[PDB]
Symmetry: C2
Subunit: 50 residues, 2 copies
């Protein structure tokens, strides 16, 4: 279209969220429980040590 301002609004309507950023959000959310468990068991071991 020759309408200025149509590209990105159509792009934005096409792509609410970019796939790479969405997958980054997915992997970071999946990784969080593992990091929580690792830190928690590490603190448990340190407290058990004393």
């Amino acid at each position: 279209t020759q309408q200025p301002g149509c590209e990105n609004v159509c792009y934005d309507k096409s792509f609410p969220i970019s796939h790479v950023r969405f997958w980054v959000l997915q992997i970071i959310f999946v990784s969080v429980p593992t990091l929580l468990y690792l830190a928690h068991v590490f603190y448990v071991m340190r407290k058990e040590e004393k």
Copy 2:
């Protein structure tokens, strides 16, 4: 504006009627009564002749 289709619609809103065409309409409308009178008196003279 970068909006395509804005020129002529703004031009059209600006110029409902072009001045040259409007004056042509004015002068032709003014001239019509004179031509009517000339033809009418000419026909009157021709009928009077016979």
